[PDB]
């Protein structure tokens, strides 16, 4: 996990002075509990936002927003710990809001936001805001968690994002499987702007039967920077079998961003 920039982060607002310090997700209030703990946050909401780095690339960011509860515990609220947990790896990332001033009234409801947590496509996270000090042992919770589910690169806004593009979300191979003279198939496609290898999987089937009568894997070595966006057609010979006519051909890219797990592209040839 990461923040999109290491820029001077601000958590201050009129009526409140605070700096966003970073934290080890192991808070000092958990090591050393205090008797008077603040109450829980309210109305935690996480939305999908998109942002640009000081350089230029666009990233999908998590927009965390919460409000404070109306009780007097506000006086004892020292700050908040914002935490992102990826579920697949059990990776955790924290940032802490440190209230330099004391919140006394509730005249106008206090609302907070944090939009620096970079999030990845087709991923599920557990974002949580933990009011500080954290509770005493066996005390009432004082935090709010929500799961965030980021869409895949097929999402309208998502495919134009840096991680998506780098895994070829905008790559259009104009796959053309051509049936040729004497048991031969010519398969053409236009390759992407990355020096990583490719593969061709040809699988032949009978008409209306999901059993492979012939299978072949063909290698395309990593291309030169000049060879980028240019076409690479390969002619492969089929098995001799009157019946083994349905051809399914697919291209596998090996972009650094995804390696073996890149999105493949299939094309099928018919029979009579």
């Amino acid at each position: 996990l990461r923040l999109l920039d290491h820029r001077a982060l601000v958590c201050s607002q009129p009526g409140l002075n605070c700096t966003v310090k970073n934290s080890t997700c192991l808070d000092d209030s958990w090591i050393h509990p205090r008797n008077l703990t603040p109450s829980s946050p309210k109305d935690l909401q996480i939305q999908l936002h998109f942002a640009h780095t000081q350089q230029g690339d666009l990233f999908p960011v998590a927009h965390i927003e919460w409000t404070l509860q109306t009780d007097a515990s506000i006086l004892y609220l020292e700050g908040a710990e914002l935490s992102v947990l990826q579920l697949n790896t059990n990776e955790r990332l924290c940032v802490r809001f440190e209230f330099l001033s004391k919140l006394r009234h509730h005249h106008r409801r206090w609302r907070f936001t944090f939009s620096h947590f970079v999030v990845d496509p087709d991923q599920e996270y557990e974002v949580t805001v933990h009011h500080l000090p954290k509770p005493i042992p066996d005390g009432d919770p004082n935090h709010q968690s929500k799961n965030f589910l980021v869409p895949d690169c097929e999402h309208a806004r998502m495919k134009v994002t840096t991680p998506c593009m780098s895994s070829g979300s905008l790559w259009d191979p104009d796959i053309t499987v051509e049936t040729l003279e004497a048991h031969q198939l010519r398969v053409s496609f236009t390759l992407w702007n990355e020096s990583t290898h490719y593969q061709i999987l040809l699988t032949s089937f009978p008409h209306m039967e999901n059993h492979s009568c012939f299978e072949h894997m063909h290698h395309i070595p990593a291309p030169r920077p000049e060879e980028f966006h240019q076409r690479s057609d390969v002619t492969l010979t089929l098995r001799n079998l009157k019946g083994c006519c349905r051809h399914q051909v697919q291209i596998q890219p090996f972009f650094s961003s995804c390696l073996n797990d890149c999105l493949r592209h299939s094309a099928t040839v018919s029979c009579p």
């Binding site: 990826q86 579920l87 059990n90 087709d122 991923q123 599920e124 919770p141």
Partner: protein, 109 residues
């Protein structure tokens, strides 16, 4: 040693994330699984997401479950810091815990 000195200023060694990676596999796996939140306010880390296999068998090509194969969990023995009472010192304990991190499809013997 029975009792040790631990500096909880967690040093993060997980920084080499330079080439791009990761996706959610629990649904795409041939040994698919479900996620279960394991929370304990008294231990660091507080919440741990574990996996529980969906089936005894594995999902075939047609998508139906093949019982000639086996969805098995990938377990991992993990360190956890547990905060004590207060009463009965020490203040913290360091414990080993078994966790299911995902599932794999294996050939039975």
């Amino acid at each position: 040693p029975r009792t040790v000195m631990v500096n909880l200023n967690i040093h993060n060694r997980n920084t080499n994330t330079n080439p791009k990676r990761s996706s959610d596999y629990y649904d795409r796996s041939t040994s698919p699984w479900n996620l279960h939140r394991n929370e304990d306010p008294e231990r660091y880390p507080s919440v741990i997401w574990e996996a529980k296999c969906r089936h005894l068998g594995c999902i075939n090509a047609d998508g139906n479950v093949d019982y000639h194969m086996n969805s098995v969990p990938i377990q991992q023995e993990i360190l956890v810091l547990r905060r004590e009472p207060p009463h009965s010192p020490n203040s913290f304990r360091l414990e080993k815990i078994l966790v299911s991190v995902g599932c794999t499809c294996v050939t039975p013997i």
